[PDB]
Fold Spike glycoprotein.
Amino acid sequence: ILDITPCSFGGVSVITPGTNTSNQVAVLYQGVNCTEVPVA
Amino acid sequence: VSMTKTSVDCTMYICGDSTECSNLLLQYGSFCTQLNRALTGIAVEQDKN
Ligand SMILES: *[C@@H]1O[C@H](CO)[C@@H](O[C@@H]2O[C@H](CO)[C@@H](O)[C@H](O)[C@H]2NC(C)=O)[C@H](O)[C@H]1NC(C)=O
Ligand SMILES: *[C@@H]1O[C@H](CO)[C@@H](O)[C@H](O)[C@H]1NC(C)=O
């Protein structure tokens, strides 16, 4: 017996000051242990 | 004072990981945005409360 875990997912919320400050942004992957995100 | 904040990923609830479905869901237009909106507006007002 093999069990199926559905391939991981989440909301992506972008973190920004005003664009009238900078084009630099940070990004949050909601509820993700992101050791998997670079592997993707 | 509050309740457990929930975002329901509308298109993935309607049909998880099929574009054969997702391109049909797109014919219905705004509903799957206005749901995500609403649920996000309710989640945001928990922090308000
Ligand atoms: C993120 O996920 C990893 C698994 O990929 C978790 O790592 C395990 O952590 C426990 C406790 O340190 C160890 O006993 C396991 O051997 C670890 N496995 C690996 C592959 O490293 C990690 O704890 C998770 N962290 C969070 C905050 O979710
Ligand atoms: C952007 O912010 C600066 C102050 O940091 C301000 O002077 C300027 O008026 C703002 N931009 C616009 C388009 O109003």
Q: What stands out?
A: The pocket of 2-acetamido-2-deoxy-beta-D-glucopyranose (ligand 2) is lined by residues A 20 (CB under 6 Å). Chain A has no helices and two strands. Strands of chain A lie at 12-15, 26-29. The two ends of chain A are 27 Å apart (CA to CA).
